[PDB]
A paper describes a structure:
Among the over 800 known human G protein-coupled receptors (GPCRs), three specific receptors — [name], GPR65 (T-cell death-associated gene 8 or TDAG8), and GPR68 (ovarian cancer G protein-coupled receptor 1 or OGR1) — were identified as proton (H+ ion) sensors regulating signaling within acidic microenvironments. The three proton-sensing GPCRs exhibit different responses to extracellular pH variations, and each receptor has distinct preferences for G protein-mediated signal transduction.
Using cryo-EM single particle analysis, the structures of pH7.5GPR4–Gs, pH6.8GPR4–Gs and pH6.0GPR4–Gs complexes were determined at global resolutions of 2.9 Å, 3.1 Å and 3.1 Å, respectively. In addition, we constituted the [name]–Gs complex at a lower proton concentration (pH 8.0) and successfully solved the structure of [name].0GPR4–Gs. In pH7.5GPR4–Gq-state-1 structure, ECL2 adopts a typical β-sheet hairpin configuration observed in Gs- (pH 6.0, 6.8 and 7.5) or G13-coupled active [name]; however, in pH7.5GPR4–Gq-state-2, ECL2 resembles that in the [name].0GPR4–Gs structure, which is packed more horizontally into the 7TM bundle core accompanied by the varied conformations of ECL1, ECL3 and the extracellular ends of TMs 2, 4–7. However, the pH7.5GPR4–Gq-state-1 structure is more similar to the fully active pH6.8GPR4–Gq or pH6.8GPR4–Gs structure, including the extracellular conformation, indicating that it is in an active state. In contrast, pH7.5GPR4–Gq-state-2 and [name].0GPR4–Gs are probably in intermediate states captured at the initial stage of receptor activation at pH 7.5 and pH 8.0, respectively. Remarkably, the conformation of ECL2 in the NE52-QQ57-bound structure undergoes substantial alterations, resembling those observed in the [name].0GPR4–Gs and pH7.5GPR4–Gq-state-2 structures.
Author numbering:
A (entry chain R): 12 to 300
B (entry chain N): 1 to 127
C (entry chain A): 8 to 66, 205 to 384
D (entry chain C): 6 to 61
E (entry chain B): 3 to 340
The structure:
């Protein structure tokens, strides 16, 4: 069904376009200000805000697809491009979140080591590598129309409600390599950050608690935004591979799958806030602007 | 011209009292943290007390705590030092040094051998 | 003469490229090295700590020792070719990682001079973000002086009579309680100055040192780790 | 001995600088005015230089 | 004896003050009130010169108004081509703590110094083609604060030993030492005729010296804190001083007095650098407020603000032709304003 569970997703996407776009513009400005200050975190935040802006600017097409109902009225190629941006911007964002986490871990846990890694040139290299790798890996539907037909239904994009064979393994790869592995790296990096902050004597216990709260928020909000959709993907693909005859379950959870697709877009609002607005320095820079 | 002229010293018996004034001129007296510095015979310059731009933030050296009171009259551009219960250890030349810079929380060079704004000096000799 | 001008323009660009390459190399070398300013009195013993990481480590007007600990380069700067005035040449050291302030703990006469000197660094506009690695030196002499009993800290610091050793104190196994109270009183005078201002942009690391102490290079490394870790907390938006 | 020598040097310097012939401050201000209006047309920072003849 | 000499000094001070009051017919403001104000001087950062790694303590323009030397605390002495934002040379220094840098009026030579207590002269136009140290003047017992070339083979250096020195570069000897300051000499400015120079020190007093004769002709008081900057009026008849008292004062040699004071109530920070325009109408002052102020020298009215620096402005100076003013700051960037 595409015209049944079609109330929460469109309104939520309207909310995302309303709030993320300005906050992501300010996030991009703050990242540019950081880069002008020769900060390696600025490159990562800039690319993250660029990806969020890409997803937000692609959202109105899907809002209209809600408005026009039926199938992908815009066309086959438009379906391919917007499907790419819609299902790969999440993984680009999580990759750049993991990049921020590892950069922060290297800065805090090992302040006097890995000076070469903590450089704007290295940050640009890592950003370019991440973009190229994610785009090439997830553009298999774009290169080969046959595999896109296997993944997304040519009629209304979506993901071919009757799950395909190899796409189930690719979906397991997604849930294990594009969410679990980057989020595990995020968790480990912020655990090491918290350990180093605990070792710190200069920082007061209040500030250590604040750092713990911020790190736990960053780890947990990614979970809240992406775990429902990815666990739905894992359940769907594993069940189809094991028990392909199951059809009532698949139809029942298709609604949850679409709602979780919608809920994924909360990170485009979360990331600008939790990475620029929460900090007093970036907020002060925005006020100065 | 920054001039710091101090007066009031002299011979006083132990357990006596002296008030050391400081006629300050040539600068805005209310923008500088004034000090009191003594050079004992045969000893280096030693900081005794300081007063902030206002009457607050009065700090004394340990030797003079409880018996020396620093005071500042910004209207009259005068820095005071009321010394009570003087001990023979207090025999020194007392200089009234000011901050190098206005509206600052630092007194870097006030006990220096050749400081620009310290004053000629007044001699107290307790014996 | 446009053709002649193009040749000089290209030569100038080539010179700029060479300067850029050399500047990038010295850029890397400049981050890799941490700059330390050594401060203290004549009797503070800064030279002894300068020598003890010059004879036990890597090692005219400015005395420089380049010692390396844990493959991390450190540059120490003992400025001794200048006058007693230091309100103008101390402003050079606003980019130093830390200031190694050495204090003669035993010499009670010049303790106030050290305390006033510590206040000025802490409260200076250009040094109000530079952490201080305080080195309460000559603890061997402090132990002997207190056990002797001839000289009392109460004369130079009347608040000592009402001072009690903090629970956080970690006395040495064979340490007299009188030394421990004297030891931590001197530290608390400097920490009281440090905790009075500086917000969070400033920390003082107090360490007890002797002439035979051989761990000062390690102490500076650990403190400089905490100083730069604290900077990275703000520079990477953790704080 | 050193203090009296320094005081004598300071007194001699004061005597040397007390014999300087001093013009009226009005005349000095007039001379500075003469220089400022005299060279006003040749001051790029005062008169905004045209972009054509500006090396920056 | 000491009391008698002090009384004589006080009498001489009173006589000097009475003479100064006698020659004070009228104030500068009372005569320049009718002058039309310069208006709002809007100067933009034409070029920023990046490449220094630490704070810039000093900078000096070349005589051609095209080349420019800058000193930074990373032990580098970079010579820029301001027009093409290109770096002609980058001289590694023996001691990184450099507080002064000088450009010889004939080129061919650049001097620098600082906490090393040494004025190091570097030969640029050499037969080998590489900048090397030509002379290492070591006679100062304190830190150098300002070095200026009278010409080739002669340089005046102000140091933290309360003395200035006139050096013969070929022999590396002090031709004349200038004593009389009771504080750290912070900056000297050469007169256009090279025959005199004023030195401002940390004793809140500026002294006009005779280069050849060798004694202090006049002393200039009125500042209430350490002078950090000094600069002659385009004619050697006045000079401007900046101190930590947040005031610029224009002292005139012939009147032996201060003419007018450049201060604002909002300004509570020190003054680091002072320079005049080619006509002397504008008094550009570097501040600890991370910004510069343009002062109408005849009216003491602020004309503009040069706000482009993240850290404190440490050096300032206009070109010989008056086209542009360069402003180096502790943020490791040098900016050309016009």
């Amino acid at each position: 069904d595409s015209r049944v569970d079609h109330l929460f997703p469109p309104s939520l996407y309207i909310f995302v376009i309303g709030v993320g776009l300005p906050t992501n513009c300010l996030a991009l400005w703050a990242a540019y200000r950081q880069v002008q200050q020769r900060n390696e975190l600025g490159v990562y935040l800039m690319n993250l805000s660029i990806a969020d802006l890409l997803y937000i600017c692609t959202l109105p097409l899907w809002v209209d697809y809600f408005l026009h109902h039926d199938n992908w009225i815009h066309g086959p190629g438009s379906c391919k491009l917007f499907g790419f941006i819609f299902y790969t911007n999440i993984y680009i964002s999580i990759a750049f979140l993991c990049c921020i986490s590892v950069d922060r871990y290297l800065a805090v846990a090992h302040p006097l080591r890995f000076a070469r890694l903590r450089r704007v040139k290295t940050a640009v290299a890592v950003s370019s590598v991440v973009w190229a790798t994610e785009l090439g890996a997830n553009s298999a539907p774009l290169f080969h129309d046959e595999l896109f037909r296997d993944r997304y239904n040519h009629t209304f994009c979506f993901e071919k409600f009757p799950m395909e064979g190899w796409v189930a393994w690719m979906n397991l790869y997604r849930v294990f390599v594009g969410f679990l592995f980057p989020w595990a790296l995020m968790l480990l990096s912020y655990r090491g950050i918290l350990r180093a902050v605990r070792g710190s004597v200069s920082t007061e216990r209040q500030e250590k608690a604040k750092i713990k709260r911020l790190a736990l928020s960053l780890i947990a909000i990614v979970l809240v935004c992406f775990a429902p959709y990815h666990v739905l993907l894992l359940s769907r693909s594993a069940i189809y591979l094991g028990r392909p005859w199951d059809c009532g379950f698949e139809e029942r959870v298709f609604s949850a799958y679409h709602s979780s697709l919608a809920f994924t877009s909360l990170n485009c609002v979360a990331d600008p806030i939790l990475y620029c607005l929460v900090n007093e320095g970036a907020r002060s820079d925005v006020a100065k602007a | 011209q920054v001039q710091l002229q101090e007066s009031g010293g002299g011979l006083v018996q132990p357990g006596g009292s002296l008030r050391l004034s400081c006629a300050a001129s040539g600068f805005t007296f209310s923008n500088y943290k004034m000090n009191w510095v003594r050079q004992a015979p045969g000893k280096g310059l030693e900081w005794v007390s300081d007063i902030s731009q206002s009457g607050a933030s009065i700090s004394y050296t340990g030797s003079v705590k409880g018996r020396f009171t620093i005071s500042r009259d910004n209207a009259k551009n005068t820095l005071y030092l009321q010394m009570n219960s003087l001990k023979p250890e207090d025999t020194a030349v007392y200089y009234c040094a000011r901050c190098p810079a206005p509206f600052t929380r630092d007194c870097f060079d006030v006990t220096s051998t050749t400081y620009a704004y310290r004053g000629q000096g007044t001699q107290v000799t307790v014996s | 003469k446009t053709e002649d001008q193009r040749n000089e323009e290209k030569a100038q660009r080539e010179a700029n490229k060479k300067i850029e390459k050399q500047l990038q190399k010295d850029k890397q070398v400049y981050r890799a090295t941490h700059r330390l300013l050594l401060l203290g009195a004549d009797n503070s013993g800064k030279s002894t700590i300068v020598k003890q990481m010059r004879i036990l480590h890597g090692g005219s007007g400015i005395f420089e020792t380049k010692f390396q600990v844990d493959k991390v380069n450190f540059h120490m700067f003992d400025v001794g070719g200048q006058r007693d005035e230091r309100r103008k040449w101390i402003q050079c050291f606003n980019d130093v990682t830390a200031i190694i302030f050495v204090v003669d703990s035993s010499d009670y006469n010049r303790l106030q001079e050290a305390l006033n000197l510590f206040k000025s660094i802490w409260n200076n506009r250009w040094l109000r973000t530079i952490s201080v690695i305080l080195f309460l030196n000559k603890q061997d002499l402090l132990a002997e002086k207190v056990l002797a009993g001839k000289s009392k800290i109460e004369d130079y610091f009347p608040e000592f009579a009402r001072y009690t050793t903090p629970e956080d104190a970690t006395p040495e196994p064979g340490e007299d309680p009188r030394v421990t109270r004297a030891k931590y009183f001197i530290r608390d005078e400097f920490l009281r100055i440090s905790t009075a201002s500086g917000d969070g942009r400033h920390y003082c690391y107090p360490h007890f040192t002797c002439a035979v102490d051989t761990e000062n290079a390690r102490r500076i490394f650990n403190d400089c780790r905490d100083i730069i870790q604290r900077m990275h907390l703000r520079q990477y938006e953790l704080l | 001995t050193a203090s009296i020598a320094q005081a004598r040097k300071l007194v001699e310097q004061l005597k040397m600088e007390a014999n300087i012939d001093r013009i009226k401050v009005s005349k000095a201000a007039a001379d500075l005015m003469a220089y400022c209006e005299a060279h006003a047309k040749e001051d790029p920072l005062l008169t905004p230089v045209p972009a054509s003849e500006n090396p920056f | 004896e000491l009391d008698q000499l002090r009384q004589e000094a006080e009498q001489l001070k009173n006589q000097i003050r009475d003479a100064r009051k006698a020659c004070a017919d009228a104030t500068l403001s009372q005569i320049t009130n009718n002058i039309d104000p310069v208006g709002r001087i809007q100067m933009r950062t034409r070029r920023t010169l990046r490449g220094h790694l630490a704070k810039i303590y000093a900078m000096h323009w070349g005589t051609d108004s095209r080349l420019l030397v800058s000193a930074s605390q990373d032990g580098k002495l970079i010579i820029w081509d301001s027009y093409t934002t290109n770096k002609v040379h980058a001289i590694p220094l023996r001691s990184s703590w450099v507080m002064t840098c000088a450009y010889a009026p004939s080129g061919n030579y650049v001097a620098c110094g600082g906490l090393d207590n040494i004025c190091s002269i570097y030969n640029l136009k050499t037969r080998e083609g590489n900048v090397r140290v030509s002379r290492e003047l070591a006679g100062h017992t304190g830190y150098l604060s300002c070095c200026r070339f009278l010409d080739d083979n002669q340089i005046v250096t102000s140091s933290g030993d309360t003395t200035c020195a006139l050096w013969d570069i070929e022999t590396g000897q002090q031709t004349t030492t200038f004593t009389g300051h009771t504080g750290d000499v912070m900056s000297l400015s050469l007169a256009p005729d090279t025959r005199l120079f004023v030195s401002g020190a940390c004793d809140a007093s500026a002294k006009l010296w005779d280069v050849r004769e060798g004694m202090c002709r006049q002393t200039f008081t009125g500042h209430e804190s350490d002078i950090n900057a000094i600069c002659f009026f385009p004619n050697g008849n006045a000079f401007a001083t900046g101190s930590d008292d947040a005031t610029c004062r224009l002292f005139d040699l012939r009147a032996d007095q201060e003419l007018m004071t450049y201060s604002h109530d909002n300004i509570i920070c020190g003054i680091t650098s002072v320079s005049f325009s080619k006509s002397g109408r504008l008094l550009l002052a570097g501040y600890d407020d991370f910004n510069c102020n343009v002062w109408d020298a005849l009216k003491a009215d602020r004309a503009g603000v040069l706000a482009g620096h993240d850290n404190r402005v440490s050096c300032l100076g206009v070109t010989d032709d008056g086209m542009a003013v360069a402003t180096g700051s502790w943020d490791s960037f040098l900016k050309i304003w016009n």
